[PDB]
Amino acid sequence: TRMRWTPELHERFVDAVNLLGGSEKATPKGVLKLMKADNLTIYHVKSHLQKYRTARYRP
Amino acid sequence: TRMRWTPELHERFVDAVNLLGGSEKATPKGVLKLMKADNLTIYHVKSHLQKYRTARYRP
DNA sequence: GCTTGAGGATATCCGA
DNA sequence: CTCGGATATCCTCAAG
Hints:
The structure is a homodimer.
Chain A: H1 7-19, H2 28-35, H3 42-53
Helix pairs in contact in A: 1-2, 2-3
The structure holds a DNA duplex.
Subcellular location (chains A, B): Nucleus; Cytoplasm
Subunit structure (chains A, B): Interacts (via C-terminus) with SPX4 (via N-terminus) in the presence of inositol polyphosphate. Interacts (via C-terminus) with SPX1 and SPX2 (via SPX domain). Interacts with RLI1 in the nucleus.
Protein name (chains A, B): Protein PHOSPHATE STARVATION RESPONSE 2
């Protein structure tokens, strides 16, 4: 099994990230708890969030 | 097997990527091929280059 | 049909 | 068990 990130899951994810105060303050366990998605592990979120954090470079 | 990216090995990589017009134009075959380090695959090099091309790491 | 390489997405590993 | 980071594997789509 290899998951992939439909756009609706991505939006749910980014809503969770935003509720936790941004990509930098959010952590996987939080994002997962908020998303409430079946068949989804902390590792799915961990990897996806690492990708998300590397779209913006802050000084 | 798991590689481990030394800092001066990373230098050689940067050196090479710069010989090839930077992170965007540079290619894994090309830069592996320019680095001439032994015990170094194309696969090591593409994973590293993917990390370097991101908006976070390219400066 | 092989055998490659490319970019991007996703998973697995390391050390704290 | 969690986190952040580093590194490898997978997929799709090419080329030769």
